[PDB]
Amino acid sequence: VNSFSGYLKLTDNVYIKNADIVEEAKKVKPTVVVNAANVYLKHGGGVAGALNKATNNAMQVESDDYIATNGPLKVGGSCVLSGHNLAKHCLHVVGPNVNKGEDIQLLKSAYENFNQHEVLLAPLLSAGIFGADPIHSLRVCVDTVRTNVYLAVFDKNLYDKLVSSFL
Ligand SMILES: CNC(=O)Nc1ccc(C(=O)N[C@H]2c3ccccc3C[C@@H]2C(=O)O)cc1
């Protein structure tokens, strides 16, 4: 039993809710919140900008030190950093950005990072400003992630479309 509330169950291990991931993180304090990161951990907009703003820029400060030490992430890769006031940990995962021309097949590799964590609160990777089809992202999530994932979808219209079209 966990504290996630109001989710629709899609499969054995995937759950979905129309919610603001920032507000959801603030209320649940999950062990892991996933950030829709880029390789430079520059949290300017989308989910990343929202999560970082909610940390009063502490996420960005920590991220800049991480990059200065380790260099950029790979597309499809991830790193674990602090969750600050939102979660115990933040798993920064880089899905391909279609608006940068990155290979969508890398979306499966990106979701594989979730399997290293038993339970996660997450957005749909590569959705929103990353330019992928969220219906496709949900399909890859369901077919790749085996651990327990609670997906937060900010847009109610998109949420309803994702549920209604789910196979
Ligand atoms: C004050 N609170 C807030 O600003 N919250 C806030 C702001 C923006 C987003 C967002 O862009 N999310 C989408 C996003 C972004 C980048 C990559 C993939 C996805 C999928 C997400 C979705 O469409 O569900 C989510 C929450």
Dist CA 137 CA 141 (whole Å): 6
Q: Domain tally for the chain?
A: 1
> Residue 46: CB within 6 Å of ligand 1?
yes
Name the experimental technique: X-ray
Give the pair of three-digit tokens for residue 1: 């039993």
- Could you list the residue range(s) of the whole structural domain that residue 159 is in? 8-165
Give the residue whose CA is nearest to atom 4 of ligand 1: 50
Within-domain flag for 1? no
Ligand 1 contact, 96 CB (< 6 A):
no
Query: What secondary structure does DSSP assign to 88-132, as a single string?
Result: SEEEEE----GGGT--TTHHHHHHHGGGGSSEEEEPPTT-GGG--
How far is it, in rounded angstroms, from Cα 88 to Cα 143?
27
Ligand 1 atom with the shortest distance to the CA of 23: 2
106 within domain boundaries: yes
CATH number, position 130? 3.40.220.10
Residue located nearest, by CA, to atom 13 of ligand 1: 128
